[PDB]
Amino acid sequence: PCDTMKVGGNLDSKGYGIATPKGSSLGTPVNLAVLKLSEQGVLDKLKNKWWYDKGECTSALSLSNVAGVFYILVGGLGLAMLVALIEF
Amino acid sequence: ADIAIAPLTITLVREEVIDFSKPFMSLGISIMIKKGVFSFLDP
């Protein structure tokens, strides 16, 4: 529902990191896999798909900032025409 | 278990006991808080 907001900036800078137990056979290859994905740009594609794809959330003045005065003007022109025709 | 493909955050203490990889996404701590026509008369 977009009922909240982020304020200010980041207190500390860090990164999420895959983990493995000491001496794992997976540790050496996962590093190379991460670097290859980073170079290819895959991580950015996943980020865009799961973050931006879920998105549900001087300068001159614009007709919007003054439209009210235009509404009053036209309404007045109308009231005037009505008064005149009534008198006629 | 044998691996953690998770949103796990790197830190000095956890490295002393387990081996991390190169970060796959960067981040930082942050703070989360709760979020006229006749306007020409406002002045």
Binding site: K54 | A1, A4, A6
Partner: peptide, 30 residues
């Protein structure tokens, strides 16, 4: 060879599929 993968449901990193009752194996997580 098979990897024991640990995770938590911290969206959007890990979250169950809709109607995952009919999903079997790792497919129940998206």
């Amino acid at each position: 060879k098979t990897v024991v993968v640990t995770t938590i449901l911290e969206s959007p990193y890990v979250m169950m599929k809709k109607n995952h009752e009919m999903l079997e194996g790792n497919e129940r997580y998206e």
